[PDB]
Design an enzyme around this catalytic site. Structure first.
Site, PDB file in Angstrom:
ATOM      1  N   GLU A  85       0.792  -1.238   0.050  1.00  0.00           N
ATOM      2  CA  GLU A  85       0.119  -0.070   0.032  1.00  0.00           C
ATOM      3  C   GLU A  85       0.845   1.282   0.028  1.00  0.00           C
ATOM      4  O   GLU A  85       0.651   2.009  -0.835  1.00  0.00           O
ATOM      5  CB  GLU A  85      -0.911  -0.094   1.283  1.00  0.00           C
ATOM      6  N   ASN A 102      -7.323   8.805  -6.127  1.00  0.00           N
ATOM      7  CA  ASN A 102      -8.104   7.806  -6.854  1.00  0.00           C
ATOM      8  C   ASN A 102      -8.934   8.553  -8.117  1.00  0.00           C
ATOM      9  O   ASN A 102      -9.561   9.650  -7.778  1.00  0.00           O
ATOM     10  CB  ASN A 102      -8.963   7.253  -6.016  1.00  0.00           C
ATOM     11  N   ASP A 134     -11.882   8.254  -8.828  1.00  0.00           N
ATOM     12  CA  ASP A 134     -13.116   8.665  -8.304  1.00  0.00           C
ATOM     13  C   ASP A 134     -13.105  10.071  -7.455  1.00  0.00           C
ATOM     14  O   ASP A 134     -13.977  10.543  -6.970  1.00  0.00           O
ATOM     15  CB  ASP A 134     -14.028   7.387  -7.176  1.00  0.00           C
ATOM     16  N   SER A 166     -11.688  10.511  -4.552  1.00  0.00           N
ATOM     17  CA  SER A 166     -11.153  10.657  -3.013  1.00  0.00           C
ATOM     18  C   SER A 166      -9.533  10.039  -3.203  1.00  0.00           C
ATOM     19  O   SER A 166      -8.893  10.111  -4.201  1.00  0.00           O
ATOM     20  CB  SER A 166     -11.752   9.085  -2.744  1.00  0.00           C
ATOM     21  N   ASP A 207      -6.257   8.085  -0.929  1.00  0.00           N
ATOM     22  CA  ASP A 207      -5.869   7.136   0.297  1.00  0.00           C
ATOM     23  C   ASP A 207      -4.709   7.815   0.993  1.00  0.00           C
ATOM     24  O   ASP A 207      -3.758   8.309   0.288  1.00  0.00           O
ATOM     25  CB  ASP A 207      -5.315   5.927  -0.467  1.00  0.00           C
ATOM     26  N   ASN A 254      -8.952   5.450   2.885  1.00  0.00           N
ATOM     27  CA  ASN A 254      -9.593   6.210   1.864  1.00  0.00           C
ATOM     28  C   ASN A 254     -10.591   7.355   2.294  1.00  0.00           C
ATOM     29  O   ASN A 254     -11.554   6.983   3.289  1.00  0.00           O
ATOM     30  CB  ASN A 254     -10.192   5.118   0.912  1.00  0.00           C
ATOM     31  N   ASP A 276     -15.669  -4.381   8.454  1.00  0.00           N
ATOM     32  CA  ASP A 276     -16.776  -3.861   7.677  1.00  0.00           C
ATOM     33  C   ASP A 276     -17.582  -4.741   7.002  1.00  0.00           C
ATOM     34  O   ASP A 276     -18.788  -4.475   6.540  1.00  0.00           O
ATOM     35  CB  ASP A 276     -16.418  -2.626   7.194  1.00  0.00           C
TER      36      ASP A 276
END
Ligand SMILES: [Au+]
Ligand SMILES: [Au+]
Ligand SMILES: [Au+]
Length: 129
Positions: A35, A46, A48, A50, A52, A59, A101
């Site tokens: 990562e 990203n 979209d 967003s 990280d 995120n 989650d």
């Protein structure tokens, strides 16, 4: 801060990640390697919109607030900048929520694609833990 491999292993173990949600310490170290390359200051935007953040690339769409991710949530109740600290506490606490989650460590795409199913214990070889 760029952690050494066994330095990060020790810190993650101290904070209770070894085998949190059943994921061994080597899984978490391997995830951090791919990562962030063990760099607490890593950030990556990203498609979209967003971003990280930090050692585990958490995120901004669900987990932290960066002020620039429309329609997002902040389920860890933290500014995304807290995830860039040399102190990994906030990243670990948020990682515990994420891995709880529903999809386990599949939430980390580099874990799924680069660590899952592999010899993850190699990531803690030589470490005194
Ligand atoms: Au740092
Ligand atoms: Au802790
Ligand atoms: Au710490």
């Amino acid at each position: 801060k760029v952690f050494g491999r066994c330095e990060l292993a020790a810190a993650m173990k101290r904070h209770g990640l070894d085998n949190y949600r059943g994921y061994s310490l080597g899984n978490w170290v391997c995830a951090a390697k791919f990562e962030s390359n063990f760099n607490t200051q890593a950030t990556n935007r990203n498609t979209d919109g967003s971003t990280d953040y930090g050692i585990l690339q958490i995120n901004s769409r669900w987990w932290c607030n960066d002020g620039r991710t429309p329609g997002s949530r902040n389920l860890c109740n933290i500014p995304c900048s807290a995830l860039l600290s040399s102190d990994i506490t906030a990243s670990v606490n948020c990682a515990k929520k994420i891995v709880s989650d529903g999809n386990g460590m599949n939430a980390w795409v580099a874990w799924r694609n680069r660590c899952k199913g592999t010899d993850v214990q190699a990531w803690i070889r030589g470490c005194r833990l």
